[PDB]
Design an enzyme around this catalytic site. Structure first.
Site, PDB file in Angstrom:
ATOM      1  N   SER B 112       0.820  -1.211   0.000  1.00 58.53           N
ATOM      2  CA  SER B 112       0.000   0.000   0.000  1.00 58.53           C
ATOM      3  C   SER B 112       0.858   1.268   0.000  1.00 58.53           C
ATOM      4  N   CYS B 149      -2.969  -5.742   2.067  1.00 57.01           N
ATOM      5  CA  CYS B 149      -4.358  -5.366   1.832  1.00 57.01           C
ATOM      6  C   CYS B 149      -4.903  -6.008   0.559  1.00 57.01           C
ATOM      7  N   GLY B 153      -5.815  -9.336   2.767  1.00 59.37           N
ATOM      8  CA  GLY B 153      -6.277  -8.342   3.737  1.00 59.37           C
ATOM      9  C   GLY B 153      -7.596  -7.675   3.375  1.00 59.37           C
ATOM     10  N   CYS B 154      -7.644  -6.327   3.369  1.00 60.35           N
ATOM     11  CA  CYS B 154      -8.909  -5.610   3.171  1.00 60.35           C
ATOM     12  C   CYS B 154      -9.719  -6.118   1.975  1.00 60.35           C
ATOM     13  N   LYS B 157     -10.988  -9.959   2.340  1.00 61.30           N
ATOM     14  CA  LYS B 157     -11.840  -9.946   3.533  1.00 61.30           C
ATOM     15  C   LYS B 157     -13.197  -9.290   3.243  1.00 61.30           C
ATOM     16  N   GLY B 223      15.110  -7.267  -0.446  1.00 59.67           N
ATOM     17  CA  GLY B 223      16.051  -6.188  -0.195  1.00 59.67           C
ATOM     18  C   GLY B 223      16.523  -6.123   1.248  1.00 59.67           C
ATOM     19  N   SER B 290      -8.981  -9.991  17.904  1.00 65.46           N
ATOM     20  CA  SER B 290      -8.761  -8.767  17.141  1.00 65.46           C
ATOM     21  C   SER B 290      -9.824  -8.625  16.047  1.00 65.46           C
ATOM     22  N   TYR B 291      -9.798  -7.508  15.308  1.00 64.76           N
ATOM     23  CA  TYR B 291     -10.790  -7.368  14.242  1.00 64.76           C
ATOM     24  C   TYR B 291     -10.601  -8.428  13.160  1.00 64.76           C
ATOM     25  N   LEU B 294     -12.509 -11.578  14.418  1.00 68.41           N
ATOM     26  CA  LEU B 294     -13.966 -11.476  14.436  1.00 68.41           C
ATOM     27  C   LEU B 294     -14.535 -11.380  13.021  1.00 68.41           C
ATOM     28  N   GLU B 295     -13.853 -10.653  12.132  1.00 65.78           N
ATOM     29  CA  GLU B 295     -14.314 -10.531  10.752  1.00 65.78           C
ATOM     30  C   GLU B 295     -14.309 -11.893  10.062  1.00 65.78           C
ATOM     31  N   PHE B 319     -10.456  -0.789  21.237  1.00 71.41           N
ATOM     32  CA  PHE B 319     -11.699  -0.150  20.797  1.00 71.41           C
ATOM     33  C   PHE B 319     -12.641   0.043  21.993  1.00 71.41           C
ATOM     34  N   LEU B 435      -3.161   1.190   8.920  1.00 72.10           N
ATOM     35  CA  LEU B 435      -4.265   1.146   7.970  1.00 72.10           C
ATOM     36  C   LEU B 435      -3.769   1.489   6.573  1.00 72.10           C
ATOM     37  N   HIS B 565     -33.738  11.689   4.680  1.00 66.76           N
ATOM     38  CA  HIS B 565     -34.751  10.707   5.060  1.00 66.76           C
ATOM     39  C   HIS B 565     -35.226   9.927   3.835  1.00 66.76           C
ATOM     40  N   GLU B 570     -29.103   9.554   9.331  1.00 65.02           N
ATOM     41  CA  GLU B 570     -29.775  10.760   9.811  1.00 65.02           C
ATOM     42  C   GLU B 570     -30.002  10.755  11.321  1.00 65.02           C
TER      43      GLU B 570
HETATM   44  C1  LIG Z   1     -44.059  10.124  -3.460  1.00 67.71           C
HETATM   45  C2  LIG Z   1     -43.326  11.004  -2.478  1.00 67.71           C
HETATM   46  C3  LIG Z   1     -42.085  10.598  -1.984  1.00 67.71           C
HETATM   47  C4  LIG Z   1     -41.386  11.386  -1.067  1.00 67.71           C
HETATM   48  N1  LIG Z   1     -40.151  10.945  -0.618  1.00 67.71           N
HETATM   49  C5  LIG Z   1     -39.498  11.704   0.249  1.00 67.71           C
HETATM   50  C6  LIG Z   1     -38.204  11.238   0.738  1.00 67.71           C
HETATM   51  O1  LIG Z   1     -37.630  10.189   0.417  1.00 67.71           O
HETATM   52  N2  LIG Z   1     -37.604  12.122   1.657  1.00 67.71           N
HETATM   53  C7  LIG Z   1     -38.138  13.331   2.112  1.00 67.71           C
HETATM   54  O2  LIG Z   1     -37.499  14.007   2.940  1.00 67.71           O
HETATM   55  N3  LIG Z   1     -39.354  13.734   1.652  1.00 67.71           N
HETATM   56  C8  LIG Z   1     -39.989  12.962   0.757  1.00 67.71           C
HETATM   57  N4  LIG Z   1     -41.223  13.381   0.294  1.00 67.71           N
HETATM   58  C9  LIG Z   1     -41.761  14.665   0.790  1.00 67.71           C
HETATM   59  C10 LIG Z   1     -42.472  14.542   2.133  1.00 67.71           C
HETATM   60  O3  LIG Z   1     -43.542  13.607   2.033  1.00 67.71           O
HETATM   61  C11 LIG Z   1     -43.060  15.902   2.519  1.00 67.71           C
HETATM   62  O4  LIG Z   1     -42.028  16.879   2.422  1.00 67.71           O
HETATM   63  C12 LIG Z   1     -43.661  15.930   3.929  1.00 67.71           C
HETATM   64  O5  LIG Z   1     -44.648  14.902   4.080  1.00 67.71           O
HETATM   65  C13 LIG Z   1     -44.229  17.288   4.286  1.00 67.71           C
HETATM   66  O6  LIG Z   1     -44.909  17.200   5.558  1.00 67.71           O
HETATM   67  P1  LIG Z   1     -46.020  18.249   5.963  1.00 67.71           P
HETATM   68  O7  LIG Z   1     -46.172  18.200   7.487  1.00 67.71           O
HETATM   69  O8  LIG Z   1     -45.704  19.574   5.398  1.00 67.71           O
HETATM   70  O9  LIG Z   1     -47.351  17.689   5.274  1.00 67.71           O
HETATM   71  P2  LIG Z   1     -47.943  16.222   5.125  1.00 67.71           P
HETATM   72  O10 LIG Z   1     -46.926  15.216   5.551  1.00 67.71           O
HETATM   73  O11 LIG Z   1     -48.458  16.130   3.690  1.00 67.71           O
HETATM   74  O12 LIG Z   1     -49.196  16.260   6.187  1.00 67.71           O
HETATM   75  C14 LIG Z   1     -50.328  17.133   5.982  1.00 67.71           C
HETATM   76  C15 LIG Z   1     -51.571  16.451   6.520  1.00 67.71           C
HETATM   77  O13 LIG Z   1     -52.627  17.422   6.729  1.00 67.71           O
HETATM   78  C16 LIG Z   1     -53.833  16.875   6.228  1.00 67.71           C
HETATM   79  N5  LIG Z   1     -54.786  17.952   5.948  1.00 67.71           N
HETATM   80  C17 LIG Z   1     -54.886  18.690   4.797  1.00 67.71           C
HETATM   81  N6  LIG Z   1     -55.835  19.598   4.825  1.00 67.71           N
HETATM   82  C18 LIG Z   1     -56.416  19.434   6.073  1.00 67.71           C
HETATM   83  C19 LIG Z   1     -57.484  20.093   6.719  1.00 67.71           C
HETATM   84  N7  LIG Z   1     -58.183  21.096   6.171  1.00 67.71           N
HETATM   85  N8  LIG Z   1     -57.803  19.693   7.973  1.00 67.71           N
HETATM   86  C20 LIG Z   1     -57.103  18.700   8.529  1.00 67.71           C
HETATM   87  N9  LIG Z   1     -56.072  18.014   8.022  1.00 67.71           N
HETATM   88  C21 LIG Z   1     -55.776  18.428   6.781  1.00 67.71           C
HETATM   89  C22 LIG Z   1     -53.400  16.047   5.023  1.00 67.71           C
HETATM   90  O14 LIG Z   1     -54.398  15.124   4.582  1.00 67.71           O
HETATM   91  C23 LIG Z   1     -52.171  15.359   5.623  1.00 67.71           C
HETATM   92  O15 LIG Z   1     -52.569  14.249   6.422  1.00 67.71           O
HETATM   93  C24 LIG Z   1     -41.954  12.596  -0.627  1.00 67.71           C
HETATM   94  C25 LIG Z   1     -43.199  12.993  -1.105  1.00 67.71           C
HETATM   95  C26 LIG Z   1     -43.892  12.208  -2.022  1.00 67.71           C
HETATM   96  C27 LIG Z   1     -45.237  12.670  -2.527  1.00 67.71           C
HETATM   97  C1  LIG Z   2      -6.640  -9.655   7.411  1.00 65.67           C
HETATM   98  C2  LIG Z   2      -6.380  -8.172   7.311  1.00 65.67           C
HETATM   99  C3  LIG Z   2      -7.429  -7.310   6.987  1.00 65.67           C
HETATM  100  C4  LIG Z   2      -7.219  -5.934   6.879  1.00 65.67           C
HETATM  101  N1  LIG Z   2      -8.298  -5.120   6.569  1.00 65.67           N
HETATM  102  C5  LIG Z   2      -8.084  -3.816   6.472  1.00 65.67           C
HETATM  103  C6  LIG Z   2      -9.211  -2.955   6.131  1.00 65.67           C
HETATM  104  O1  LIG Z   2     -10.378  -3.316   5.925  1.00 65.67           O
HETATM  105  N2  LIG Z   2      -8.867  -1.591   6.051  1.00 65.67           N
HETATM  106  C7  LIG Z   2      -7.597  -1.044   6.252  1.00 65.67           C
HETATM  107  O2  LIG Z   2      -7.435   0.185   6.135  1.00 65.67           O
HETATM  108  N3  LIG Z   2      -6.559  -1.873   6.553  1.00 65.67           N
HETATM  109  C8  LIG Z   2      -6.800  -3.187   6.668  1.00 65.67           C
HETATM  110  N4  LIG Z   2      -5.741  -4.020   6.977  1.00 65.67           N
HETATM  111  C9  LIG Z   2      -4.409  -3.414   7.186  1.00 65.67           C
HETATM  112  C10 LIG Z   2      -3.646  -3.171   5.889  1.00 65.67           C
HETATM  113  O3  LIG Z   2      -3.484  -4.397   5.182  1.00 65.67           O
HETATM  114  C11 LIG Z   2      -2.256  -2.620   6.216  1.00 65.67           C
HETATM  115  O4  LIG Z   2      -2.411  -1.508   7.094  1.00 65.67           O
HETATM  116  C12 LIG Z   2      -1.462  -2.189   4.978  1.00 65.67           C
HETATM  117  O5  LIG Z   2      -1.360  -3.267   4.040  1.00 65.67           O
HETATM  118  C13 LIG Z   2      -0.094  -1.642   5.332  1.00 65.67           C
HETATM  119  O6  LIG Z   2       0.650  -1.401   4.117  1.00 65.67           O
HETATM  120  P1  LIG Z   2       2.229  -1.335   4.129  1.00 65.67           P
HETATM  121  O7  LIG Z   2       2.673  -0.592   2.863  1.00 65.67           O
HETATM  122  O8  LIG Z   2       2.710  -0.764   5.401  1.00 65.67           O
HETATM  123  O9  LIG Z   2       2.682  -2.867   4.036  1.00 65.67           O
HETATM  124  P2  LIG Z   2       2.143  -4.091   3.180  1.00 65.67           P
HETATM  125  O10 LIG Z   2       0.858  -3.724   2.517  1.00 65.67           O
HETATM  126  O11 LIG Z   2       2.119  -5.282   4.136  1.00 65.67           O
HETATM  127  O12 LIG Z   2       3.337  -4.269   2.066  1.00 65.67           O
HETATM  128  C14 LIG Z   2       4.675  -4.654   2.453  1.00 65.67           C
HETATM  129  C15 LIG Z   2       5.276  -5.498   1.346  1.00 65.67           C
HETATM  130  O13 LIG Z   2       6.719  -5.548   1.480  1.00 65.67           O
HETATM  131  C16 LIG Z   2       7.133  -6.887   1.277  1.00 65.67           C
HETATM  132  N5  LIG Z   2       8.452  -7.095   1.882  1.00 65.67           N
HETATM  133  C17 LIG Z   2       8.722  -7.428   3.184  1.00 65.67           C
HETATM  134  N6  LIG Z   2      10.002  -7.546   3.451  1.00 65.67           N
HETATM  135  C18 LIG Z   2      10.620  -7.293   2.236  1.00 65.67           C
HETATM  136  C19 LIG Z   2      11.976  -7.266   1.846  1.00 65.67           C
HETATM  137  N7  LIG Z   2      12.997  -7.502   2.680  1.00 65.67           N
HETATM  138  N8  LIG Z   2      12.254  -6.966   0.555  1.00 65.67           N
HETATM  139  C20 LIG Z   2      11.240  -6.720  -0.280  1.00 65.67           C
HETATM  140  N9  LIG Z   2       9.926  -6.706  -0.024  1.00 65.67           N
HETATM  141  C21 LIG Z   2       9.679  -7.006   1.259  1.00 65.67           C
HETATM  142  C22 LIG Z   2       6.001  -7.725   1.860  1.00 65.67           C
HETATM  143  O14 LIG Z   2       6.036  -9.092   1.446  1.00 65.67           O
HETATM  144  C23 LIG Z   2       4.805  -6.957   1.290  1.00 65.67           C
HETATM  145  O15 LIG Z   2       4.578  -7.335  -0.065  1.00 65.67           O
HETATM  146  C24 LIG Z   2      -5.926  -5.417   7.083  1.00 65.67           C
HETATM  147  C25 LIG Z   2      -4.876  -6.277   7.388  1.00 65.67           C
HETATM  148  C26 LIG Z   2      -5.088  -7.649   7.501  1.00 65.67           C
HETATM  149  C27 LIG Z   2      -3.929  -8.553   7.840  1.00 65.67           C
END
Ligand SMILES: Cc1cc2nc3c(=O)[nH]c(=O)nc-3n(C[C@H](O)[C@H](O)[C@H](O)COP(=O)(O)OP(=O)(O)OC[C@H]3O[C@@H](n4cnc5c(N)ncnc54)[C@H](O)[C@@H]3O)c2cc1C
Ligand SMILES: Cc1cc2nc3c(=O)[nH]c(=O)nc-3n(C[C@H](O)[C@H](O)[C@H](O)COP(=O)(O)OP(=O)(O)OC[C@H]3O[C@@H](n4cnc5c(N)ncnc54)[C@H](O)[C@@H]3O)c2cc1C
Ligand SMILES: COCCNC1CCN(C(C)=O)CC1
Ligand SMILES: COCCNC1CCN(C(C)=O)CC1
Ligand SMILES: COCCNC1CCN(C(C)=O)CC1
Ligand SMILES: COCCNC1CCN(C(C)=O)CC1
Lengths: 587, 587
Positions: B112, B149, B153-154, B157, B223, B290-291, B294-295, B319, B435, B565, B570
């Site tokens: 790396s 890695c 490794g990463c 895994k 080396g 270690s991680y 467990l992984e 941790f 890392l 949402h 969130e």
């Molecule tokens: C298909 C779709 C997908 C959406 N997806 C997302 C999303 O992924 N993320 C996101 O953040 N937003 C999303 N939105 C937007 C989100 O639904 C609205 O921004 C949010 O519901 C606004 O809330 P509000 O309190 O202003 O009104 P509303 O949630 O519309 O509530 C108003 C309520 O007042 C009632 N009401 C109306 N007139 C009267 C009355 N005279 N007397 C009594 N009650 C009355 C209505 O019938 C309704 O029950 C989506 C909207 C739609 C249409």
């Molecule tokens: C199972 C496992 C999972 C991991 N998962 C993650 C993860 O999800 N996320 C993350 O950020 N990190 C993860 N890591 C850590 C990550 O692999 C290391 O932090 C990273 O590889 C370090 O890089 P490096 O350059 O220090 O050494 P390395 O990547 O180990 O490279 C060193 C290289 O030098 C070579 N070498 C050694 N001696 C000599 C020599 N004398 N002459 C020539 N070459 C030589 C070695 O054989 C090797 O090829 C994980 C590690 C393991 C073991």
């Protein structure tokens, strides 16, 4: 300053105690109220640098300068000795319930914003009523408490999106060693709808339980504001009556629009109907190009359907158009057909058969912008051509609440309308992003200012979004074209890259379809003006970056932060190819 | 100051041009070098506020104050007229290749860090060699270029982690309406390994192509640094020779440890062997906590295996231990068995049958910390009891490079060892997070300082992590116990919540197993000291928050940012339940 805040707080709080955390007389008043189950706000003067000043200002209302001081709806009630006197003499219950109005708060609309506002206000002792009613769709669809998101929006849309995503997980599994054969597996629409609707049912019930447990009155009734403090309610029997309230929050949301053409209302449906439809739509036309249109078309295709999208002009108007085109290109390569630069002119060949769970059949006629004709048959036609409020049903125009040219409520930055006791939140607040978490934050923060003396405003800028198309698109801040318009092309630098999820490698998915970019302002230390990502889990990727942009992240902040490996998101920490350089972004 | 930087830059750059973007004489020197395919660094003096000062300092080396000025390995070559003279007379090729040493840079270790450092240095004209060799494991396993890695490794895994995750997607699909029956599907280990290994093969080849295209010499050789500038190399035929280099980067990484007990080396394996094992391990014991342990245990169980983990003391030492226990509790509820407070004493009942692709059989004997005995049979035993460098194979102790008590290289904050021309990066750098993205950033940034006059250091603080257990655990910053130790319990506030992914609802997964918390410092405006999340896609969730923590986010920064949402991420934007309050965190 301090004096102005204190007057506003005392006047609008329902029940409020001014206290100090180190005072046993305050603790004994707290205990008495706690025991009588009187809810109230508390302001601890020893925890505000402004506390000594506030203590003196209290004397303008009570003629005393000590703590505790209890107020009910603008009236000084008494100090320690006086409150316990009322308690001992069983006069306290009638003192705290005494009000000019039926309710301290009436919320019209029981959705995302209105439910949040109502529950938070009742926390501080405000006597609160939440009104909700669901006008049925043209074919008669209705649903329970909770608003658009819960019932016909974010929640069912993402659950059916997940159902479509599992298609690709089934295909991927064979490459990772699992013995299934994807080509022999099919999808059952009605089984999916039953499960989605069962979850929505638990949400409807959950909201009813929550209101009851906060002592909020829930009225399933249509509300109409007929004067600043009077709300006329009509129930499910058409019985009509009037209730009064001190503060009013309007939170009634929007509903889908239909185009003004023959056959649309009679023979088409909208998103309101789709999420509980008893039969699979079959061969489907989606008219429109908003995120609703594309999200719905996208999962219908992933569930095996024959799907066409009819686009008047562009996809995702108002979003970054480079990203909009990559979104649509992915959908077209994975099944979805597009009728570009096209509009419908009229829509019946077969009636829907509800007994045997079968759609009808429709003939759609339209035309392209050059004049050529469109004509084709579909089983279902879905209209996603926008949403609008209907405040003429909510609001007598003689109350004096000012609306803009789109019929949304013009508000100050603390959600106040032109009538001093009336507020508006959520989708009907003119000019605000129309999203569920914005509505929740506005409502909760507003209730705290009215009934607990809080000052914090809702921040509506740089609110992040995600479009849940089959390949998801997350964004925060300015599109590239908007940044160039505001600052000039010379002052904008764009860093970008393609990427491939590690999960896509063994599965043999596409090399250079996922994409990300940062739009930056050169003359402001390379400030990140906008972040854009197309890829799996785009919502989880984008969210955390929204905090950093809120605090003004620069390119240097992204460079000095170290990536998590292996993830899609880490590609943002090592971006280096600029658009100005012309170097390819491929992997 | 400026003078000190300029001396350092001129002395260590291979080929460097001092220029101005507005100078046609500079452009004509650039064109000549570009055309002769001479690579070099360029410093544009009109783009540094310090440029006028640097222009005067140049005269200490060249006796001239104008641009352009060309230097090769510490020697002033000439101005415009002089460089073009050498070009016209075909003297320029021999001028830029003239060196006291074979190479400007020798990188020992092709993983790396070493590959990143080598490729970035050759960008600026440094003559570069990368040495890599893979010592075979006790049973003879070896692999290609790219480091731990990429090969063991990463990368493998996470690909096998994805294979385990698809188990749960297959179960979830029926609830979302798909017609498959999970109980009739099985997993084929060898098919998975073939696909994983084919991807690793494309990475090995990709690195060889990249080095060739940057004009980097790749030597597949072991080396050994035998003096500050001399590296002894041994090739695959045991041929031995010596090469010299100006700067040396040590980047040799680590390898797995074995416990000092009978049978371990002969009959067990490590992670080095697991990722290319030709047969499914069968009934498996994992020794360690270690991680890595467990992984590996986690995906083996998801692929249908019978898996036990033997834990000396605690899970995930170092941790956050509340999060470590929730991680382990999830694994135990989903299959993985645990032998707690236990160590092994000795390990053969049946020899591995490589022709018929079958593991052997082993008898493991051990004891619990109270003295009770452990005895049980397993087909495979995997040791994950840590990793260590072996620098006695890399480094003659007479060179004078100082090591710490764990055999890692003690470095200054610009990666310099106690020998002025020798640097160390990656896992062998004492005290640094171990890392892959840390190693890449260290190597790239170091090459820029040596050969392009850069100054930016690598920032090793608050580097985010993710543990890819079956339910993933992402973190950035301090554990809760570490924050309390450093600042005191009174000064620490913890906000937390359970959550349920929307995707888990229709699938009927668990309600209160996913969890998140923010550890904050009260007396520093509620600064976020540590972020912790257990849930799906934890790496994508955590990454973006690492930028905000790098810039010093507070609780108020999280509160004012609006959520996306519906997402898992969130939930961080609306946290409110504190641990001090004793209120339940359930949903
Ligand atoms: C298909 C779709 C997908 C959406 N997806 C997302 C999303 O992924 N993320 C996101 O953040 N937003 C999303 N939105 C937007 C989100 O639904 C609205 O921004 C949010 O519901 C606004 O809330 P509000 O309190 O202003 O009104 P509303 O949630 O519309 O509530 C108003 C309520 O007042 C009632 N009401 C109306 N007139 C009267 C009355 N005279 N007397 C009594 N009650 C009355 C209505 O019938 C309704 O029950 C989506 C909207 C739609 C249409
Ligand atoms: C199972 C496992 C999972 C991991 N998962 C993650 C993860 O999800 N996320 C993350 O950020 N990190 C993860 N890591 C850590 C990550 O692999 C290391 O932090 C990273 O590889 C370090 O890089 P490096 O350059 O220090 O050494 P390395 O990547 O180990 O490279 C060193 C290289 O030098 C070579 N070498 C050694 N001696 C000599 C020599 N004398 N002459 C020539 N070459 C030589 C070695 O054989 C090797 O090829 C994980 C590690 C393991 C073991
Ligand atoms: C003129 O008033 C008509 C009122 N419409 C609605 C119909 C029934 N409603 C409910 C609560 O479902 C409430 C009143
Ligand atoms: C054996 O019965 C099959 C059911 N017959 C259905 C009746 C409804 N049909 C429609 C509405 O087109 C389709 C055929
Ligand atoms: C004493 O030197 C032994 C060297 N060991 C290794 C074995 C073979 N190597 C390769 C390149 O595979 C390089 C040398
Ligand atoms: C029909 O042939 C089946 C293969 N026989 C295998 C030979 C190897 N066996 C071992 C090694 O236990 C298991 C049985």
């Amino acid at each position: 300053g301090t004096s102005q805040w204190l007057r506003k707080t005392v006047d609008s709080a329902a029940v409020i105690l001014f206290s100090k955390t180190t005072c046993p007389y305050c603790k004994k008043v707290k205990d008495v109220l706690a025991e009588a189950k009187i809810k109230h706000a508390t302001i601890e003067l020893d925890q505000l640098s402004n506390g000594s000043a506030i203590q003196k200002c209290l004397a303008s209302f009570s003629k005393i300068e000590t703590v505790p001081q209890m107020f009910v709806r603008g009236k000084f009630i008494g100090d320690s000795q006086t409150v316990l006197k009322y308690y001992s003499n069983d006069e306290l219950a009638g003192i705290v319930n005494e009000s000019k109005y039926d309710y301290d708060l009436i919320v019209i609309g029981g959705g995302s914003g209105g439910l949040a506002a109502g529950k938070e206000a009742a926390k501080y002792g405000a006597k609160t009523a939440v009104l909700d009613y669901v006008e049925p769709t043209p074919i008669g669809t209705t649903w329970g408490l909770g608003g658009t998101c819960v019932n016909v929006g974010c929640i069912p849309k993402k659950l059916m999106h997940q159902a479509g995503l599992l298609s690709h997980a089934l295909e991927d599994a064979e490459h990772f060693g699992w013995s299934l054969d994807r080509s022999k597996i099919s999808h059952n629409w009605s089984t999916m709808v039953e499960g989605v609707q069962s979850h929505i049912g638990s949400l409807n019930w959950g909201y009813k339980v929550a209101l009851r447990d906060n002592q909020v009155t829930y009225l399933n009734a249509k509300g109409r504001l007929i004067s600043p403090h009077e709300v006329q309610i009509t129930d499910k029997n058409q019985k009509v009556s009037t209730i009064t309230g001190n503060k009013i929050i309007l939170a009634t949301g929007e509903r889908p629009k239909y185009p003004e053409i023959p056959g649309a209302v009679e023979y088409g449906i909208t998103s309101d109907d789709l999420f509980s439809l008893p039969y699979f739509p079959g061969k489907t036309l989606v008219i429109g190009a908003s995120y609703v249109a594309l999200e719905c078309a996208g999962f219908l295709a992933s569930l095996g359907g024959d799907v066409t999208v009819m686009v008047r002009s562009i996809l995702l108007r108002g979003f970054d158009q480079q990203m909009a085109e990559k979104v649509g290109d992915y959908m077209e390569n994975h099944g979805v057909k597009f009728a570009k630069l096209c509009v419908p002119d009229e829509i019946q060949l077969k009636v829907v058969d509800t007994e045997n769970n079968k759609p009808g059949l429709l003939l759609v006629k339209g035309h392209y912008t050059d004049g050529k004709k469109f004509e084709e048959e579909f089983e279902t036609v879905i209209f996603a051509v926008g949403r609008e409020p209907q405040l003429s049903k909510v609001l007598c125009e003689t109350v004096g609440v000012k609306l803009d040219k789109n019929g949304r409520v013009v508000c100050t930055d603390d959600e106040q309308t032109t009538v001093s006791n009336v507020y508006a939140i959520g989708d009907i607040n003119a000019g605000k992003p129309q999203l569920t978490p914005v509505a929740i934050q506005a409502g909760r923060y507003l209730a705290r200012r009215l009934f607990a003396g809080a000052t914090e405003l809702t921040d509506y800028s740089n609110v992040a979004t995600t479009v849940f198309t089959p390949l998801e698109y997350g964004a925060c801040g300015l599109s590239e074209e908007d940044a160039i318009e505001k600052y000039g092309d010379k002052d904008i630098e764009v860093y970008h890259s393609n990427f491939k999820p590690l999960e896509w490698t063994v599965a043999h998915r596409e090399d250079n379809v996922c994409y990300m970019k940062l739009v930056c302002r050169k003359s402001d230390n390379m400030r990140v003006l906008g972040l854009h990502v197309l890829g799996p889990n785009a919502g989880e990727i984008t969210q955390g970056y929204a905090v950093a942009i809120k605090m003004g992240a620069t390119k240097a902040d992204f460079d000095r932060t170290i990536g998590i490996h292996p993830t899609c998101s880490e590609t943002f920490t090592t971006l280096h190819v600029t658009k100005k350089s012309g170097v390819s972004p491929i992997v």
